[PDB]
Amino acid sequence: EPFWADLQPRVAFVERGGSLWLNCSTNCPRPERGGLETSLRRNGTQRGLRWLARQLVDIREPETQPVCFFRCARRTLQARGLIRTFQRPDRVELMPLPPWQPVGENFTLSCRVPGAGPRASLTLTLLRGAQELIRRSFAGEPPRARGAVLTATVLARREDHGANFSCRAELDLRPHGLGLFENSSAPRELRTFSLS
Amino acid sequence: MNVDLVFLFDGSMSLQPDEFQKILDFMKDVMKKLSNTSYQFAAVQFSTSYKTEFDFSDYVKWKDPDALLKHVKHMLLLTNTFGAINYVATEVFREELGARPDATKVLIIITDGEATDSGNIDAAKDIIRYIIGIGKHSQTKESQETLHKFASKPASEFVKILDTGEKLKDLFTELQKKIY
Ligand SMILES: *[C@@H]1O[C@H](CO)[C@@H](O[C@@H]2O[C@H](CO)[C@@H](O)[C@H](O)[C@H]2NC(C)=O)[C@H](O)[C@H]1NC(C)=O
Ligand SMILES: *[C@@H]1O[C@H](CO)[C@@H](O)[C@H](O)[C@H]1NC(C)=O
Ligand SMILES: *[C@@H]1O[C@H](CO)[C@@H](O)[C@H](O)[C@H]1NC(C)=O
Ligand SMILES: *[C@@H]1O[C@H](CO)[C@@H](O)[C@H](O)[C@H]1NC(C)=O
Ligand SMILES: *[C@@H]1O[C@H](CO)[C@@H](O)[C@H](O)[C@H]1NC(C)=O
Ligand SMILES: [Mg+2]
Fold it and tell me: Where in the cell is the protein located (chain B)?
């Protein structure tokens, strides 16, 4: 443990498509070879005797872990980072409703929110007017999972004739200091009638 | 003519997961196209360290490249390519792994050319080396020079660059820098 490498910031959250400066450093007295192994495109480098700073750009993967290294005498000293991306709910889509829905029968509401995430930070809600019918947090999904779907069966009523159904996606990155990003679908009107 | 052929494939963190899968598919396709008696294969992954994922005896027993490569996990570390090449020369072309002493030795090295080590590959001098370039990092001058350093000569004939569908991204990037 006497000589080391360090990568700062060691964990970073970037908006999908964004960029980030990383600084890889060592206390090795005379480092022989130094670098940063990542699949990310770079767009800027700065160097000093015991440090290397790189700007990584167009960061699109859910997760990537750059490996910073310096060769120190006979040893390679390394440090590993984590870059996570987030993607706002730019697309929130409620699937089409039936042209006409029989009263007293079920129909399906499906909200699709492609690409947004991390999925564990998403909450999707299905609404009739301003009333929330179903709310689902995706807490506990895998960290690299993206996108979400929320489907529910709803019993058609006479009252629901002409009512607007919609859905809302929330990406809550506030635990990470990054804000709450919301979007809602365009409304869809239900038309009901009695088969009798 | 008997030919012992080794795939030396880059499992370093600089290659995307989709690119590594394409490297695996490339190896499978080459094997299917040369599935005769005369060629026998081995595959070695390299990143920081080296792993013979299958050897010539494995090839002969299983034949199915899907079978032979099922246990491969992407190493996701550094790119010690000179070391890897030296490992193959001294440790993989051996009778113990089923190599035939009568066979012509060939190495197919698949990498973005961004080596994190240095040295020489003199131990591999008498092995025919074909280089397969892949990845955004193969596009730099230093990477292109590295790939040519590894190749048998004339490097023009032994170096090939896989098109993974990102050439327009490389163009935009370059133009954005020169045009602004
Ligand atoms: C990257 O990190 C290093 C160290 O954390 C930065 O600062 C220099 O570090 C050297 C030792 O490597 C020290 O001797 C100096 O005191 C530091 N200089 C300054 C001006 O603070 C280095 O500047 C960082 N580089 C970038 C681009 O942020
Ligand atoms: C790329 O580098 C240039 C300066 O060299 C800078 O102006 C630009 O912001 C960088 N690209 C990105 C995506 O930040
Ligand atoms: C909401 O959607 C639009 C595209 O329909 C998008 O441009 C905007 O960034 C989104 N807002 C948030 C906070 O996700
Ligand atoms: C509608 O769906 C609910 C929930 O699955 C079910 O219990 C009920 O039997 C259904 N009603 C009709 C009219 O089919
Ligand atoms: C549903 O939406 C339409 C327009 O989008 C609106 O005119 C109508 O009042 C709404 N239906 C009601 C009142 O529930
Ligand atoms: Mg690499």
Answer: Cell membrane
Residues of A in contact with B13 (CB under 8 A): 37-39, 65-67
Calculate how close chain A gets to B102, using CA atoms only, in Å.
38
Q: What's B22's domain CATH number?
A: 3.40.50.410
Q: Contacts for B39-42 with beta carbons within 8 Å, 24 or more apart? A: B39/B3, B39/B5, B40/B2, B40/B3, B40/B4, B40/B5, B40/B98, B40/B100, B40/B103, B41/B5, B41/B6, B41/B7, B42/B4, B42/B5, B42/B6, B42/B7, B42/B92, B42/B97, B42/B98, B42/B99
| Cis ω before A118 (30° cut-off from 0) | yes
Domain around B43: 1-180
Best mutation target, A67, A80, A82, to test chain B (most B CBs within 10 A): A67
Return the closest-CA partner of residue B38 out of B133, B103, B110: B103
Decide whether any atom of ligand 1 lies within 6 Å of the A140 Cβ.
no
Specify the CATH architecture of the domain A87-196.
Sandwich (2.60)
Segments making up each domain of chain A, as ranges: 1-86, 87-196
The first and second tokens of residue A70, run together, are 């310096």
**A37 class by beta-carbon count within 10 Å (0-12 exposed, 13-18 middle, 19+ buried):** buried
